């Protein structure tokens, strides 16, 4: 799996309910949100700051 | 999986309900949102700031 | 999967309800929004700011 | 999947309801919006700001 | 699995309920959110800041 | 701050640039969009679905 | 701060730039978007689904 | 701070730049987006599902 | 601070830069986004599901 | 601080830079994002599911 920097975010929730009931039968089920508070963050920054300067000579007598 | 910087965000929720009831039978089910609070963030910035300057000499006597 | 910067955002929600009822049978089901609070952000900026200047010499005597 | 910068936003919601009822049977189901609060943002800016200047010499005596 | 920097975030929750009931039978089950408080963060920054300067000589007599 | 349901969305961006330049001076600045990808959503629905029915008796012999 | 349900979304970005330059001076600054990927979602739904039914008796002999 | 359910989302970014430069002086600064990937979600739903039914007696001999 | 359920989300970033430069002086500074990957989620749901049913007697001989 | 359930999320980042430079002086500083990967989640759900049923007697001879 070569490479330089790779982020993968996959979200696949699934919720199903099954209940049986025959003549004179009853049932009650509750299903909450498949997902509950879920986040994925990934930042990648690349910059180059090169400071090049050439200073000969400033002042000499009486500053 | 070569490459330089790759973000993938997939969201595929699914919610289904199944209940049986025969003559003289009753049922009640509840299904909440397939997804609940879900975010994916990914930023990638690349910049180059090169500062090049050439200063011979400023002032010399009495500044 | 080569490349430089790639964002993918897919949203495919699905909600279905199934209930049985025979002579003298009744049922009640509730289905919330397939999706609940879901966002995907991805920014990619690339700029180059090169500052090039040439300064010989400013002032010399009495500044 | 080569390339430099690629954003994909797909939205395909689906909501269906199925209920059975025979002589002397009744049912009631509720279906909320297939989608609930969903956004996708992606910006890509690329600019180059090169500042080139040539300054010989300003002033010399008595500034 | 060679490479320089690689982050993977996969989220696949699943919730199902099964209950039996025959003539004169009833059941009640509760299912909470498949996921509960789950986050994945990963940042990778790479920058080079080289400061190069050449200073001959400043002042000499009476500073 | 009493009340039942209240959404407020205010957007007031501001961008200004200031640069100095004297005889033999030059400058260059760049300003991007004050706002960058910004949305506010808020929905509030309230409905009541009451199902009332009265079934005496259906069939009796040989169904 | 009493009340039942209250959402507030305020967005006020500000970007300013200041640079000095005297005879034989130059500067270059860059300003990105005051805001970068920012969303606020808030939904509030309230409904009541009461199912009331009265079934005397269905069938009796030979179903 | 009494009340039942209250969400507050405030976004106020600010970015400023200040640089000095005298005769024979130069500077370069960079400012990124005041905000970078920022979202606020908050949903509040309240519903009541009461199932009331009265079943006398179904069938009796030979089902 | 009494009350039943209260969420507060405040976002106030600030970025400033200050640099000095005199005749024959230069500087370069970089400022990244005040905010970097920041989210706040909070959901509050309250519902009541009461299932009330009355079943006398189903079948008796030969089921 | 009485009350039943209370979540508070405050985000206030601040980044500043200060550098001195006199005739024949130069400096370079770098400032990363005030915030780096920061999330706050808090969910509070309250529901009551009471199942009440009355079954006299089903079948008796030959099931």
The H-or-E segment that residue C7 falls in is strand C7-11
- Report the 10 Å Cβ neighbour count for A21: 29
Token readout for A50 is 């090169």
Task: Supply the DSSP symbol for I5.
Answer: -
Q: Which of I25, I32, I35 to mutate to test the interface with G (most CBs of G within 10 A)?
A: I35
Report which of B60, B57, G24 is spatially closest to residue C61, judged by C-alpha positions: B60
Cβ-based burial of H34 (10 A; exposed 0-12, middle 13-18, buried ≥19): buried
Does the CA dihedral D22-D23-D26-D31 come out positive or negative?
Answer: positive
Collect all residues of chain G within an 8 Å Cβ-Cβ radius of residue B43.
Answer: 36-37
- CA–CA gap between residue I38 and residue I32 (Å, rounded): 15
Angle in degrees, CA J46, C36, I9, rounded to 5: 75
- In this structure, are residues E44 and A41 in contact, taking their beta carbons and an 8 Å threshold? no
Collect all residues of chain F within an 8 Å Cβ-Cβ radius of residue D60.
Answer: none
Cβ-based burial of E48 (10 A; exposed 0-12, middle 13-18, buried ≥19): exposed
- How many CB pairs below 8 A link I and J? 215
Of B10, B15, B59, nearest to A58 by CB-CB distance is B59
- Report the 10 Å Cβ neighbour count for D9: 16
Of I51, I55, I59, nearest to A28 by CB-CB distance is I51
- Report the 10 Å Cβ neighbour count for H22: 24
Of H23, H28, H41, nearest to D37 by CB-CB distance is H41
Task: Supply the DSSP symbol for B7.
Answer: E
Token readout for E13 is 């929750």
User: Partners of C3 in the beta sheet?
Assistant: none
- In this structure, are residues B41 and A7 in contact, taking their beta carbons and an 8 Å threshold? no
Report which of C4, E11, E5, B8 is spatially closest to residue A1, judged by C-alpha positions: E5
- CA–CA gap between residue C21 and residue A23 (Å, rounded): 10
Placement of tokens 């990957």 in the chain: I37
- CA–CA gap between residue C15 and residue B35 (Å, rounded): 11
Does the CA dihedral F4-H39-F34-F19 come out positive or negative?
Answer: positive
Lay out the sheet containing G26-31: strands in order across.
Answer: F26-31, G26-31, H26-31, I26-31, J26-31
Placement of tokens 């199932």 in the chain: H51
Report which of B63, B22, B59, G50 is spatially closest to residue A63, judged by C-alpha positions: B63
Contacts of B7 (CB under 8 A, 6+ apart): A7, A8, A9, A42, B40, B42, B44, C6, C7, C8, C42
In chain H, positions 24-53, which contact chain B (CB-CB < 8 Å)? 24, 26, 28, 30, 32, 36-37, 39, 41, 43, 49, 51, 53
Of G32, G42, G59, nearest to H32 by CB-CB distance is G32
Report which of A4, A33, E60 is spatially closest to residue J41, judged by C-alpha positions: A33
Within 13 Å and on the Cβ side, how many CA atoms surround E63?
6
How is chain B split among helix, strand and coil, in percent rounded to 5? 0, 45, 55
Task: Supply the DSSP symbol for D37.
Answer: S
- In this structure, are residues A21 and B19 in contact, taking their beta carbons and an 8 Å threshold? yes
Alpha carbon dihedral J30, J35, J37, J43, in 10-degree steps, equals 180
- CA–CA gap between residue F56 and residue G54 (Å, rounded): 7
3-state secondary structure of D31: strand
Placement of tokens 């969420």 in the chain: I7
| Phi, psi angle pair for E26, to nearest 5° | -150, 145
- CA–CA gap between residue I32 and residue I43 (Å, rounded): 32
3-state secondary structure of G46: coil
| Phi, psi angle pair for C16, to nearest 5° | -135, 150
Token readout for A60 is 């000499």
Closest-CA distance of chain J to residue B58, Å: 8
Distance of CA F11 to the CA centre of its chain: 12
Residue of E nearest to A28 (CA): E28
- CA–CA gap between residue H9 and residue F6 (Å, rounded): 13
| Phi, psi angle pair for D14, to nearest 5° | -145, 130
Lay out the sheet containing I51-55: strands in order across.
Answer: F51-55, G51-55, H51-55, I51-55, J51-55
Does the CA dihedral F7-F32-J29-G22 come out positive or negative?
Answer: negative
Placement of tokens 């989210």 in the chain: I39
- CA–CA gap between residue C50 and residue G17 (Å, rounded): 19
3-state secondary structure of I61: strand
Q: How far is CA A44 from CA A50, C63, G28, in A?
A: 20, 48, 25
A–D contact: 3+ Cβ pairs < 8 A: no
Report which of C50, C15, C9 is spatially closest to residue C30, judged by C-alpha positions: C15
Radius of gyration over every alpha carbon of chain D, rounded to an integer in angstroms: 33
Placement of tokens 């959404």 in the chain: F7
Ramachandran bin of A25, using left for φ above 0, alpha for ψ from -120 to 50, beta for the remaining angles:
beta
DSSP codes, C12-49: --EEEEEE---TT-EEEEEE--S--SEEEE------B-
- CA–CA gap between residue D46 and residue J61 (Å, rounded): 84
Collect all residues of chain G within an 8 Å Cβ-Cβ radius of residue B24.
Answer: 55, 58
- In this structure, are residues B18 and C21 in contact, taking their beta carbons and an 8 Å threshold? no
């Amino acid at each position: 799996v070569p490479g330089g920097g790779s982020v993968q975010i996959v979200y696949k929730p699934v919720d199903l309910s099954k209940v049986t009931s025959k003549c004179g039968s009853l049932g009650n089920i509750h299903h909450k949100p498949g997902g509950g508070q879920v986040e994925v963050k990934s930042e990648k920054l690349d910059f180059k700051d090169r400071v090049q300067s050439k200073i000969g000579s400033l002042d000499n007598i009486t500053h």
